[PDB]
Amino acid sequence: AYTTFSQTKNDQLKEPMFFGQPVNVARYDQQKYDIFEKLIEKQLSFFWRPEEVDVSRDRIDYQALPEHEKHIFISNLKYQTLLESIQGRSPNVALLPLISIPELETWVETWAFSETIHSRSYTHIIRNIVNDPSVVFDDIVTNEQIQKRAEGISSYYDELIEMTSYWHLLGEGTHTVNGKTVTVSLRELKKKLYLCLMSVNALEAIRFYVSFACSFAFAERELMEGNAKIIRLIARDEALHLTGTQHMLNLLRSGADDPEMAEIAEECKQECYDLFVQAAQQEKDWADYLFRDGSMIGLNKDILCQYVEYITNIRMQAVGLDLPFNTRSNPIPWINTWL
Amino acid sequence: AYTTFSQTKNDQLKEPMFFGQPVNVARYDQQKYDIFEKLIEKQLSFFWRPEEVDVSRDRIDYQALPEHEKHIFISNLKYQTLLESIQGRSPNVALLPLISIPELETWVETWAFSETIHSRSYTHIIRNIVNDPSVVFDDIVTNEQIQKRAEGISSYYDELIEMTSYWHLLGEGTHTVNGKTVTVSLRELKKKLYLCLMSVNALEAIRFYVSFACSFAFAERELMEGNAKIIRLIARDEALHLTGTQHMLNLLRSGADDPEMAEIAEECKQECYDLFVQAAQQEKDWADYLFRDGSMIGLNKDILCQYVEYITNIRMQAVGLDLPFNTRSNPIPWINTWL
Ligand SMILES: [Hg+2]
Numbered sequence: 224a225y226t227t228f229s230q231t232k233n234d235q236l237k238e239p240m241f242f243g244q245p246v247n248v249a250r251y252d253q254q255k256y257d258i259f260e261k262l263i264e265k266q267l268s269f270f271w272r273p274e275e276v277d278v279s280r281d282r283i284d285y286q287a288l289p290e291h292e293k294h295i296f297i298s299n300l301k302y303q304t305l306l307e308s309i310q311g312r313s314p315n316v317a318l319l320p321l322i323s324i325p326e327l328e329t330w331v332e333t334w335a336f337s338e339t340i341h342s343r344s345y346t347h348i349i350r351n352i353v354n355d356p357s358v359v360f361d362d363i364v365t366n367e368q369i370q371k372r373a374e375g376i377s378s379y380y381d382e383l384i385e386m387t388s389y390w391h392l393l394g395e396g397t398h399t400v401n402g403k404t405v406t407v408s409l410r411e412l413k414k415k416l417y418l419c420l421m422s423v424n425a426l427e428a429i430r431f432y433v434s435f436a437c438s439f440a441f442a443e444r445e446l447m448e449g450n451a452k453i454i455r456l457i458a459r460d461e462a463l464h465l466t467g468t469q470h471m472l473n474l475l476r477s478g479a480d481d482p483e484m485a486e487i488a489e490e491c492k493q494e495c496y497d498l499f500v501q502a503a504q505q506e507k508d509w510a511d512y513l514f515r516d517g518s519m520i521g522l523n524k525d526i527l528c529q530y531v532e533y534i535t536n537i538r539m540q541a542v543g544l545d546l547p548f549n550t551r552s553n554p555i556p557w558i559n560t561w562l
Numbered sequence: 563a564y565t566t567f568s569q570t571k572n573d574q575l576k577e578p579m580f581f582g583q584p585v586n587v588a589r590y591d592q593q594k595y596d597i598f599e600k601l602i603e604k605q606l607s608f609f610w611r612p613e614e615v616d617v618s619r620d621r622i623d624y625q626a627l628p629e630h631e632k633h634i635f636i637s638n639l640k641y642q643t644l645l646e647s648i649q650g651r652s653p654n655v656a657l658l659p660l661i662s663i664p665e666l667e668t669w670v671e672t673w674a675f676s677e678t679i680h681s682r683s684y685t686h687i688i689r690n691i692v693n694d695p696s697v698v699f700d701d702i703v704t705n706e707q708i709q710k711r712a713e714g715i716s717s718y719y720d721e722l723i724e725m726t727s728y729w730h731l732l733g734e735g736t737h738t739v740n741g742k743t744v745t746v747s748l749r750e751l752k753k754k755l756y757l758c759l760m761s762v763n764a765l766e767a768i769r770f771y772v773s774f775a776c777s778f779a780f781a782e783r784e785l786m787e788g789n790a791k792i793i794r795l796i797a798r799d800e801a802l803h804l805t806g807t808q809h810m811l812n813l814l815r816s817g818a819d820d821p822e823m824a825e826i827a828e829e830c831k832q833e834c835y836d837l838f839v840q841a842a843q844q845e846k847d848w849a850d851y852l853f854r855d856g857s858m859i860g861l862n863k864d865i866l867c868q869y870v871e872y873i874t875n876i877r878m879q880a881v882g883l884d885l886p887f888n889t890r891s892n893p894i895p896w897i898n899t900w901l
Pocket residue numbers: 376379380418419420422423
């Protein structure tokens with residue numbers, strides 16, 4: 224029941240962010256929430272081309288790196304690449320079919336587009352520091368440690384996408400599909416979208432930043448300068464992305480948008496909390512693999528763990544959730560220089 | 563079912579463009595078809611911002627235009643805006659769930675992104691030539707003369723999207739849904755994709771170009787020059803988009819990418835021919851409405867009609883279809899100054 228151009232003349236200022244009438248005319252002279260137009264405008268102002276960044280000295284740097292530091296650097300990079308691959312396509316596939324206001328539809332497409340640029344920047348780095356990129360790319364798919372840390376991301380998107388197709392195809396109600404009873408609840412689909420967004424928020428605001436810290440640890444040593452420039456550019460974009468998800472989530476929570484979404488956010492709040500706690504643990508467990516061959520001065524399991532708790536508390540407070548970790552000062556204040 | 567990250571390590575160089583394993587890793591160091599990587603790079607190199615184009619004198623030009631000329635200009639503008647609205651979201655929603663090679667997936671997202679910029683440029687023009695943009699935007703949705711192709715265009719996309727969902731959810735076979743038999747055939751889905759791409763090819767290659775002729779007719783008289791500068795940039799982008807669809811179609815019909823599609827294409831060749839001619843006829847009929855109050859310098863029903871046949875012959879030959887019209891030289895050579 225999805226349509227690429229709804230024929231009903233509707234007031235786009237009165238539609239909910241999600242599950243309303245599919246967006247027909249793409250107009251940018253007005254909006255229900257100007258924050259999304261501001262984000263589009265900002266993201267477009269930050270346009271950059273990865274291949275332009277000089278990474279010619281990164282190969283020399285990387286090669287001269289101690290084997291365990293090469294492991295740390297490359298493992299971190301492979302994970303970042305995995306996340307960008309997923310983020311380049313997922314916002315579009317999972318959210319586009321559910322958006323009902325123009326400013327948000329375009330923001331998602333612009334956000335997704337910027338992620339593909341991030342993916343392109345990683346190919347630029349990889350092909351300029353290793354002999355055969357295929358070994359790195361193939362390992363991204365097979366490496367159990369990497370998939371372990373990312374476990375739950377693709378699965379959630381996939382479930383939302385499948386439920387969305389059922390909704391568009393069958394509509395609300397209880398159906399019989401190949402002799403099986405299939406329930407299609409809009410309320411349940413809204414919950415799935417809401418939690419998916421919370422998961423994306425944790426991905427954008429936590430997972431990416433933990434990886435930035437690892438990348439910048441080398442920048443502090445005056446090594447991998449090209450990669451550092453790229454990470455700074457990526458981080459600038461990620462800041463906009465997480466601002467977008469925090470606003471989507473807090474607007475839904477306020478009750479100023481879909482009233483039902485406000486109820487759902489409230490009733491499903493323990494689930495929001497649980498997903499952050501789980502994401503944090505996954506980022507922490509990754510330390511065992513990252514530092515399996517040894518750690519670096521100023522970068523080890525303890526420091527990584529401390530940073531995960533530090534940033535997780537900050538991000539959770541931003542969306543109104545209780546803090547799971549003990550409060551503490553930034554364990555790596557040097558990262559500010561790069562953000 | 564569809565997945566945002568296929569867990570199977572596959573050779574992306576051997577996958578078909580569509581219907582193969584969903585793309586997992588987004589890499590750009592290699593391609594099965596380098597044309598898509600080349601298009602991504604070219605499109606990125608062409609990035610432009612609408613707001614940076616001076617359209618300050620277009621308002622006075624518009625107000626000074628004879629009433630029928632305002633009709634010609636604004637009617638054409640509304641149709642272009644309609645097409646961009648559809649093109650900004652549709653390639654992503656319709657193609658992303660079916661692509662199996664990375665270069666094509668990212669090209670589609672880049673292509674779609676560029677279309678959203680075009681939509682933004684139309685808001686920029688509209689808000690600078692009319693007092694209340696809402697009048698223009700609302701008419702785009704309900705305008706009977708405009709909302710005719712939109713229906714046909716959106717139909718091909720909507721049908722492909724719906725059948726794609728059934729395929730991902732139920733797979734091939736004869737199913738039952740609420741007492742009704744539902745047949746899912748990959749062959750029919752492949753045909754729907756081919757028809758959809760052919761329709762998009764006609765949209766990018768003919769529909770947009772016919773509209774450019776009208777916009778530049780004003781440019782030739784040194785009027786609506788802000789609009790003209792924006793259309794020049796848009797046309798530069800559409801050239802890339804049509805190149806992309808032409809390669810997709812030719813690769814699918816040749817049999818080099820998927821024998822089944824090649825078999826299907828030959829089977830529905832007459833249908834695609836009629837589909838193309840129908841699009842040309844619709845563009846032609848638009849003249850009765852466009853020049854109902856009168857015509858202008860270098861632009862009239864007959865000239866437009868000639869240009870439609872001229873461009874259609876070229877585009878159809880480019881994708882292996884017979885020529886439906888009498889051959890002849892460009893009826894409006896002056897258009898080359900802008901294209
Ligand atoms: Hg998600």
